[PDB]
Design a protein around this ligand. Structure first.
Ligand SMILES: O=c1ccn([C@@H]2O[C@H](COP(=O)(O)OP(=O)(O)O[C@H]3O[C@H](CO)[C@@H](O)[C@H](O)[C@H]3O)[C@@H](O)[C@H]2O)c(=O)[nH]1
Length: 482
């Protein structure tokens, strides 16, 4: 019943000893691509979401039994290629000579000292990040390195890149490792299931997992969310933020409607079903609607809560898989070689699981739980005094910002790559806590101890020489130029 290409993929994955849960999931995605539909989510197929509960209005806290059954997992499998990064993004220095991983470890240390003595912590790594992460922890956090292989690390899968023309697995003799890729952070569910770790966690009495992006250092356990899921009997919960103009990269919440006749005497009830639309899933034609922050104002933080026994149950009863919608990425087998074979890379997003559970929901959270670093512009804000370190080692906005992050717009021609960004701040990172918006155009270099207030634009029209701001300069609601 399977196509010759699909069977070629099975053989390649079996010969490579890929676990069967990954194979089953990949082949189901391969079939669907071979048929035709590419899981595009057009505008006519969805509606905006209107009403959601808000974390800031909740007050009930869960008891310590619920809290002790919660696992924390941080995603760490991607690379920061967009920022000119060839390793795990979590090894970037973010503040005071400390990296994302430093603060992650310190947060876990704090929760074990003051809240949950035996907190279970996991990191999802990939083939591209595991070595660096392990070497980093051995030298700085021995207590994590001691149990890294056995308890902390969740290794995600590698799946074959498939040729566009035939859908067979690609061949790249120069470097066969480039014939494989991690299939997105949606792979967390397949990796947990296929490795037996999901079953193991449920056996050990864990009932909730809190997952968040490795680059988001504002995400920690909140006992008001756990009480909410207990009271409302929620099995999957997505934290969303009110969307700003700085939220370009990820995905937004949306809804559909399904009519259920619902037994006899009682009438049919309209039912809302929630879904996630990633940028990669929107047709380029309808991209004007995807970026409309008024129509779709709820932005996925990727702070996710999952009821582990339910996850395990629906995966078992669905062929040992979670059938998430696939994202068909288009690339060359070697990215640095635009002449190499053209391929599709099948991926999924873990937020898409909001559509897999009958009792799924979303909650609006404040910006204090969402400090993403997708660009060097984000890294500039994070490194500045606009962000502070809490007692439990989170990075949150300084109270003076009032939950509005400073809007940082840096010239992509000069500051998209890390090396260009390090030039911009060679002599010091300006004060931004009082700055509503800063725009940098052309080649610029901040001075030592600058202070930006209000709406600042630094502009250099020639871009041969760097406009170097004088040390101590203080700019208030103005454009600065040569
Ligand atoms: O195969 C992969 C790919 C990514 N990651 C990790 O997943 C996290 C998120 O990846 P990133 O590429 O930084 O984000 P996006 O997938 O573009 O967007 C995610 O995060 C956004 C919020 O920042 C949400 O809006 C999107 O819905 C959600 O999919 C990072 O820690 C990555 O390292 C993995 O572990 N494995």
């Amino acid at each position: 019943s399977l196509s010759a290409a699909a069977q070629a993929c099975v053989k390649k994955m079996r010969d490579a000893k890929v676990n069967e849960a990954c194979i089953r999931t990949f082949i189901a995605q391969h079939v669907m691509v071979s048929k035709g539909e590419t899981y595009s989510i057009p505008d006519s197929a969805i509606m905006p979401v209107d009403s959601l509960d808000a974390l800031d209005s909740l007050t009930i806290e869960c008891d310590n039994a619920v809290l002790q059954s919660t696992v924390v997992l941080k995603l760490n499998g991607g690379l920061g290629t967009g920022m000119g990064l060839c390793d795990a993004k979590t090894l970037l220095e973010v503040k005071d000579g400390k990296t994302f991983l430093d603060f992650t470890a310190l947060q876990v240390q704090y929760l074990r000292q003051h809240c949950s003595e035996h907190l279970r912590f996991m990191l999802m790594d990939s083939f591209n990040t595991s070595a660096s992460t392990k070497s980093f922890l051995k030298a700085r956090y021995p207590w994590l390195y001691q149990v890294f292989d056995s308890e902390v690390e969740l290794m995600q899968n590698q799946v074959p890149k498939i040729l566009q023309d035939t859908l067979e697995p690609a061949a790249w003799a120069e470097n066969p490792a480039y014939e494989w890729a991690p299939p997105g952070h949606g792979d967390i569910y397949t990796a947990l299931y296929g490795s037996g770790k999901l079953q193991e966690l449920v056996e050990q009495g864990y009932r909730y997992m809190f997952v968040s992006n490795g680059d988001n250092l504002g995400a920690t356990i909140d006992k008001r969310v756990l009480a909410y899921m207990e009271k409302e009997k929620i099995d999957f919960l997505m934290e969303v933020c009110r969307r700003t103009e700085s939220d370009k990269k990820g995905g937004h919440l949306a809804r559909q409607t399904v009519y259920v006749k619902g037994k006899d005497g009682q009438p049919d009830a309209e039912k809302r079903v929630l879904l996630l639309r990633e940028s990669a899933q929107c047709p380029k034609a309808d991209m004007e609607s995807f970026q409309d922050i008024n129509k779709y104002s709820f932005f996925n933080t990727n702070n996710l809560w999952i009821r582990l026994p339910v996850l395990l149950e629906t995966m078992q009863e669905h062929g040992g898989t979670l059938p998430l919608p696939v994202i068909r990425n288009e690339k060359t087998v070697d990215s640095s070689n635009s002449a190499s074979p053209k391929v599709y890379q099948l991926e999924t997003a873990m937020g898409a699981a909001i559509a897999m559970f009958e009792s799924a929901s979303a909650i609006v959270v404040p910006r204090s739980r969402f400090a993403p670093v997708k660009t060097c512009a984000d890294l500039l804000a994070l490194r500045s005094d606009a962000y502070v370190v809490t007692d439990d080692f989170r990075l949150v906005l300084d109270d003076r910002c009032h939950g509005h992050p400073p809007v940082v717009d840096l010239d992509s021609a000069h500051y998209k790559m890390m090396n260009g960004f390090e030039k911009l701040v060679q002599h010091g990172v300006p004060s931004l806590v009082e700055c509503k918006r800063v725009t940098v155009k052309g080649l610029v270099q901040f001075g030592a101890g600058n202070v930006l207030t209000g709406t600042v634009t630094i502009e250099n029209t020639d871009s041969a020489s760097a406009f170097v701001i004088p040390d101590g300069a203080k700019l208030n609601d103005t454009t600065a130029s040569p």
